[PDB]
Design a protein around this ligand. Structure first.
Ligand SMILES: O=c1[nH]c(=O)c2c([nH]1)n(C[C@@H](O)[C@H](O)[C@H](O)CO)c(=O)n2CCCCOP(=O)(O)O
Ligand SMILES: O=c1[nH]c(=O)c2c([nH]1)n(C[C@@H](O)[C@H](O)[C@H](O)CO)c(=O)n2CCCCOP(=O)(O)O
Ligand SMILES: O=c1[nH]c(=O)c2c([nH]1)n(C[C@@H](O)[C@H](O)[C@H](O)CO)c(=O)n2CCCCOP(=O)(O)O
Ligand SMILES: O=c1[nH]c(=O)c2c([nH]1)n(C[C@@H](O)[C@H](O)[C@H](O)CO)c(=O)n2CCCCOP(=O)(O)O
Ligand SMILES: O=c1[nH]c(=O)c2c([nH]1)n(C[C@@H](O)[C@H](O)[C@H](O)CO)c(=O)n2CCCCOP(=O)(O)O
Ligand SMILES: O=c1[nH]c(=O)c2c([nH]1)n(C[C@@H](O)[C@H](O)[C@H](O)CO)c(=O)n2CCCCOP(=O)(O)O
Ligand SMILES: O=c1[nH]c(=O)c2c([nH]1)n(C[C@@H](O)[C@H](O)[C@H](O)CO)c(=O)n2CCCCOP(=O)(O)O
Ligand SMILES: O=c1[nH]c(=O)c2c([nH]1)n(C[C@@H](O)[C@H](O)[C@H](O)CO)c(=O)n2CCCCOP(=O)(O)O
Ligand SMILES: O=c1[nH]c(=O)c2c([nH]1)n(C[C@H](O)[C@@H](O)[C@H](O)CO)c(=O)n2CCCCOP(=O)(O)O
Ligand SMILES: O=c1[nH]c(=O)c2c([nH]1)n(C[C@H](O)[C@@H](O)[C@H](O)CO)c(=O)n2CCCCOP(=O)(O)O
Ligand SMILES: [K+]
Ligand SMILES: [K+]
Ligand SMILES: [K+]
Ligand SMILES: [K+]
Ligand SMILES: [K+]
Ligand SMILES: [K+]
Ligand SMILES: [K+]
Ligand SMILES: [K+]
Ligand SMILES: [K+]
Ligand SMILES: [K+]
Ligand SMILES: [K+]
Ligand SMILES: [K+]
Ligand SMILES: [K+]
Ligand SMILES: [K+]
Ligand SMILES: [K+]
Ligand SMILES: [K+]
Ligand SMILES: [K+]
Ligand SMILES: [K+]
Ligand SMILES: [K+]
Ligand SMILES: [K+]
Ligand SMILES: [K+]
Ligand SMILES: [K+]
Ligand SMILES: [K+]
Ligand SMILES: [K+]
Ligand SMILES: [K+]
Lengths: 146, 146, 146, 147, 146, 146, 147, 146, 146, 146
């Protein structure tokens, strides 16, 4: 667990939630032996993929965190298409896991309930970190040694 | 089908259903003379393509197993989108069959019914493996030999 | 149109319906004086693109045939997306017409009706092959000759 | 402004009368811009456009894709539109050439006829896509290397 | 961000709204030390991506601006899908931020309200440029220096 | 061998010698019952690969013909290297036999002798076309047929 | 050790008797390793090898390229060797498959005959390249994903 | 040849000889109806390919001009190697003719004799432009038109 | 360099000399905190590059070791050219250092003298590994951290 | 001149000379307005390309400096092939000038005479910096603005 190189890129739109997701990703990392993951912040979720690409050049895994919440127009749908499309492509070009902990909810109560705050049902920041670390460890054993 | 190299990557969300899909894939595999395919477990369906890309380096077919079930948010559609996008890409980049045996249902009852348990109407795990072995055999013939 | 090298790949799901699409593709091919076209069967529509990729290496045109009918879950939508992204990409990678003769219907009744039986209103199987051939001829002309 | 740009136009043939009317719009815009002999290729359906457009983009500064997809009783409209879309988008970026999407996607015949620039049409989408191709080809020429 | 090299590409459909979004982009650029960003016009949203690609070859970031408003037909969906797939591909291919300020609304009232016209609630032009620049700045810090 | 689509590209430097290589290529093509092959002239051997690239898009085989004779400077060596790297690469990119019928001689006398005139000991022009054709036939067989 | 590896061998035909002797070496090594039916294709000259090898590498774990290039009076030896070399090297790395270079490049016929594993030959380069292909195919299988 | 877009990139080492090569290219250009080709000067032959790659984005042909002359070290061969390698690559990646008009001599007298000055035996500058225009015309014809 | 992930690939031709170079690589690795580098053998130099490529997928650097000694024929030139082009391509494709410790000598005395056998003047195995590691370390510092 | 982003990678083999080349590159840079170019050291010249590749991701130009001197074996030739081949490829993948100031001499007096020391005939470190800066400035004017 301890020897993996991990990066976390978190957007800042709905900053409060963003910070709650990043809290659960860090804590997961630190309990697995990783106290100094590369952490980067971006403004919005659309900026995540290009930053994830840069990070995957020299980390074993990248955790993509953020919060998108449906407004009054279709813009929500296109923002979510673009992030889904970018992350999948970056993982496969780089042959590196890019864990998707980007929340996509209709409401703010949904996001708060998915973010690992004191009374949340679940913590997606923490789940996405477990996923990336576990997957990087699986790739390690599949690949060439020794 | 004795001499095809088969790999099965199954995710672990709704882990009771995933084990049943894997069970049917493993039986189909063993029935066509493959007693020990390469089997890999990942956490979540989203992780399937990058592990499947690696497995395709060393195998003639890959079977992607898992279960995504719809909740209260739009997340179900972006998860399903990433899986669909990623596997098709991997199949064409590697010119290797990747069978989609990832169930995408609305309810848990629908998934239970397509995982090949005692009272289930079908087994997609089994169908996914059938399709992957069949295609690998076809390509073998289509491609260069004596 | 006698000069063109034509492959047909037909999936087998709803095999009565796949079988009329294919009868109609071969009628059209024979009526344009074709050298016995290369025909490959596959299990499901999701299998078609990797086999089309193989076939496109050695032919001027590939007709993709099969049938997808909608059920009780979202699966239909992902199956159709996969086929669509796959064919479009295979055709551009190989710069080869990949005709889409893949029905995507709500009901069995609608599919039977577009499959060119005596009482059917349309025949997608035959339409796809005319399309294939015309596009191959056009590209012959557009490309380098004396 | 566009006397030197090499334009190609590819038009599908489903709904013949409307494709003719899109192509007339395209050739008029071209003519008015100094271009009398654009390369023009016909294909049978709109799904065939992208692979013909890709070929046209090797010898041309801009490609105009014309056609008409009209929704039926099945979901099949949605997949055709998806293929066309994804393809022309790949083709333009692979080749670093404008590929103007002049392919109508309507719910009914009435709607298509209204966007093909017939005498009483509200608009002419074939015209629009040519202007768009030609103006993007010119933009890119100034942007690109000259001395 | 005075040493950042910025380009801005604005489509022209709905001229008043674009001029406004372009004006917001440009006021944000000047307010962060950038007097002469490269500014290019195209007619429609869909032309943005190929122009963006030429601009990503010697700028640190590109802002996409334009307006898509829904009508009576399906065409809106395909315009937005095109723009989204295009700009997502352009950014990762060139490893350069393309900030998306393409408005995608159901109504004109909605679009005018997001354009930073005098009575508007927000300006997505202004917002897109803040994103471009922060991201450029982050990449700079992340990349090779010494 | 009647089925194969053959292009010949011959450079024009030492045109008497290029002209016998080409007469010998066409004799061989006609003696295998060929549909009038596509013939293109180019000015010099360095021109051949880009034109071969174009020709390989629409043919099963390309014969490259021309003559390079050594002079007083190192130029000869670079001209021959260029042609070599170009042809080998064009053939692999297009997976198409690109026969090398390009003489590379110290003197004019040696070239005339390998160019298949009555008193010549060899004919490289004719050798290259047999090679072209045989390789195209072999690949037809190796690839996907019924 | 190599019962499960799928081996292809491509051999050029210039200097027929020596190519036969290289191919005999290859098929013996294969047989002794559990492999009785390697895919074997003949091509006319060594410059044809790379494009045939590339095709063989889509359906096979290893390719053995056999042949014989013998220096003449002109510089033309040097370019043939260069093409063969560059090609088999590209083909192996593009396809992530071993392509064993069993192509002799000699100054005289005497030298080639000495490296084709005839009864009095000093060595058999056809044998060597098969062992090399098969041992690299096996290496890469352990290195690659298994469970 | 009126409507071919021509570019000439000349290096500046042995600048008297380079200007003479350029002079012959410019006259050939002007003779076939091209009065203002794109002309670019670089310092050294090694710089030619990356500028030529850029010029190929916007032109149908490119002419590479320059003069490398052998000194006391092996550097002459690696300079010549890089030029040869780089230009061939650029020509095939861009599917655009790049005429090699870079003289590679042993002495300054040999270069003076191939640069098309009053008493020179030939003009390579002129030949390089001839070859590039001729090839661009050929490809135009080979490629798609009415 | 304790956190560097190293692989070493040593060919086997001239077994005593390779064992020696491999021993030098391995003593340098241990002397810089690396107890278990991944060590793989291949038969000949030419097999190095495809193995190197598999190893570059999860190591920070790869050391190539082997011995090529010149004989009576041209073959030596083509073995060295192969190895050089292969390893150069493998490093840039994978953006990973491949340190070249493939000895290329005219005589056996020469090779034994560069192998760090007991009486040797140098050890190019030892040297190649110092290069691998410094370069890994430099890239680490140059790449994304925070 | 002042706005270009410049990197210099210098190997350390023949350290004295290496340092004399780097002195002339820095000084050239500082007189052009560039006081803080990114400077990286590598052990040998073979390590230069992979470091040059990393640097070209975010600089307008890279200057490659070093010294190779022929010894007793052909190793010199292969070291020089690999550097020539790597640098040309890195410049073209990145569309960035990579100035070659890697000296290749038969002797040490030749190197000292090419390195810009008090009594040298020439300074190649300084020439290669002028070349890269001048070329980057030329690309700036060819490319997109304003
Ligand atoms: O050609 C097909 N038509 C269909 O209607 C269908 C197919 N294939 N497949 C699966 C097939 O393409 C692949 O072989 C698998 O992914 C394994 O890789 C299908 O699964 N279907 C059924 C489509 C919808 C029906 O069911 P539900 O009620 O579960 O929504
Ligand atoms: O240009 C077209 N417009 C249309 O409206 C349409 C086309 N083409 N095609 C087929 C064509 O693009 C391809 O030639 C084939 O797919 C073969 O590759 C169509 O099939 N359509 C009809 C779309 C909807 C109508 O019917 P339904 O009632 O079954 O949904
Ligand atoms: O910037 C745009 N905004 C829009 O709202 C719109 C554009 N462009 N375009 C077309 C343009 O990007 C392309 O230049 C062409 O396709 C040719 O290449 C649009 O067609 N629109 C309108 C979007 C839909 C409205 O209406 P109805 O559905 O009623 O026709
Ligand atoms: O993380 C985000 N969450 C959101 O909810 C949201 C973001 N980002 N962005 C934009 C951002 O990713 C990019 O920074 C820009 O496009 C510029 O490149 C958003 O625009 N949103 C809002 C999505 C929906 C709500 O609004 P409306 O009421 O206008 O539909
Ligand atoms: O396998 C070969 N061995 C050789 O020694 C040789 C071959 N092929 N070829 C040609 C062959 O590879 C290709 O079929 C053609 O080039 C067409 O693409 C040869 O030409 N050779 C002879 C090399 C040297 C002899 O003669 P000269 O005296 O003219 O230099
Ligand atoms: O590591 C090696 N060292 C050498 O000195 C040598 C090798 N390999 N190989 C072959 C090997 O890398 C490849 O496995 C095969 O080509 C098949 O793929 C060699 O052939 N050699 C010998 C180099 C030349 C000597 O001799 P003569 O010129 O007298 O035959
Ligand atoms: O086919 C050719 N044969 C030759 O012998 C020769 C050619 N072409 N070319 C040039 C040609 O391929 C290109 O068209 C130019 O690069 C322009 O792009 C030649 O230059 N030659 C002459 C080869 C050597 C003679 O001369 P010197 O005495 O100068 O060494
Ligand atoms: O900059 C260098 N100059 C040289 O003269 C030289 C270097 N590097 N290298 C090796 C270096 O680039 C790499 O660090 C290693 O291969 C490991 O990757 C050298 O080996 N040399 C010496 C070149 C020739 C002299 O020796 P011989 O007497 O053994 O022929
Ligand atoms: O296999 C899965 N099935 C599911 O149903 C599901 C999964 N995975 N995942 C996780 C992703 O595969 C995961 O690995 C992350 O993206 C981290 O990279 C899920 O998040 N789900 C839930 C989808 C639907 C449920 O709920 P709401 O919309 O109510 O939130
Ligand atoms: O056009 C050139 N002609 C030449 O004869 C020559 C050039 N350029 N260059 C420079 C490269 O194009 C240059 O741009 C650098 O590599 C920096 O990137 C040269 O260095 N030369 C000289 C080659 C031969 C002379 O001498 P010695 O071997 O005696 O040192
Ligand atoms: K990585
Ligand atoms: K939390
Ligand atoms: K595979
Ligand atoms: K089961
Ligand atoms: K076959
Ligand atoms: K084809
Ligand atoms: K029928
Ligand atoms: K073009
Ligand atoms: K009209
Ligand atoms: K410009
Ligand atoms: K950029
Ligand atoms: K505004
Ligand atoms: K950094
Ligand atoms: K071909
Ligand atoms: K003849
Ligand atoms: K393989
Ligand atoms: K033998
Ligand atoms: K492994
Ligand atoms: K061009
Ligand atoms: K002149
Ligand atoms: K043509
Ligand atoms: K690596
Ligand atoms: K040692
Ligand atoms: K750069
Ligand atoms: K100096």
């Amino acid at each position: 667990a301890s020897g993996v190189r991990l990066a976390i890129v978190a957007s800042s739109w709905h900053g409060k939630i963003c910070d709650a997701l990043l809290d659960g990703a860090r804590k997961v990392a630190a309990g697995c032996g990783l106290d100094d993951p590369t952490v980067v912040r971006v403004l919005g979720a659309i900026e995540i993929p290009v930053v994830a690409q840069e990070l995957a050049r020299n980390h074993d895994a990248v955790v993509a965190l953020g919060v998108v919440i449906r407004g009054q127009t279709p813009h929500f749908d296109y923002v979510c298409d673009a992030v889904t499309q970018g992350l999948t492509r970056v993982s496969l070009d780089s042959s590196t896991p890019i864990a998707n902990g980007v929340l996509t909810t209709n409401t703010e109560e949904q996001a708060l309930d998915r973010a690992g705050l004191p009374t949340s049902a679940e913590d997606k920041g923490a789940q996405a970190t477990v996923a990336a670390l576990a997957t990087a460890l699986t790739l390690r054993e599949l690949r060439a040694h020794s």
